[PDB]
Design a binder for this molecule. Structure first.
Ligand SMILES: *[C@@H]1O[C@H](CO)[C@@H](O[C@@H]2O[C@H](CO)[C@@H](O)[C@H](O)[C@H]2NC(C)=O)[C@H](O)[C@H]1NC(C)=O
Ligand code: NAG
Lengths: 40, 49
């Protein structure tokens, strides 16, 4: 017997201080463990 | 004072990882985003509240 765990998905939210001020940004991957990022 | 912030992806709830049913949903178009704006609008006001 196999358990199927449908593949990890979640919201992509982007963070910006002042786009007017700078063109650098940071990201949130909502509801996903860090393991699933260097893996992904 | 508040209720649970739920976020739903309508493009995924209607069908998961089928590009096909997703390609069909683009013929309705706007309705998915209209609900995303709405559920963001409920979710954000839980912090405000
Ligand atoms: C992210 O997932 C990893 C597993 O891939 C979690 O690490 C496990 O934590 C438990 C409890 O300490 C250990 O028994 C396991 O040996 C750990 N697994 C590995 C492979 O190291 C980690 O806790 C998770 N992080 C979050 C924030 O959920
Ligand atoms: C943001 O825009 C104003 C003009 O409305 C400008 O004066 C200000 O320097 C800008 N901010 C940054 C960080 O450059």
């Amino acid at each position: 017997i196999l358990d199927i765990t449908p593949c990890s998905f979640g919201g992509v939210s982007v963070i910006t201080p002042g786009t007017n001020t700078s063109n650098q940004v940071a990201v949130l991957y909502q509801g996903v463990n860090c393991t699933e990022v260097p893996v992904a | 004072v508040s209720m649970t912030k739920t976020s739903v992806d309508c493009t995924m709830y209607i069908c998961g990882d089928s590009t096909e049913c997703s390609n069909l949903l683009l013929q309705y178009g706007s309705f998915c985003t209209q609900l995303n704006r709405a559920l963001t609008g409920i979710a954000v006001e839980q912090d405000k509240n």
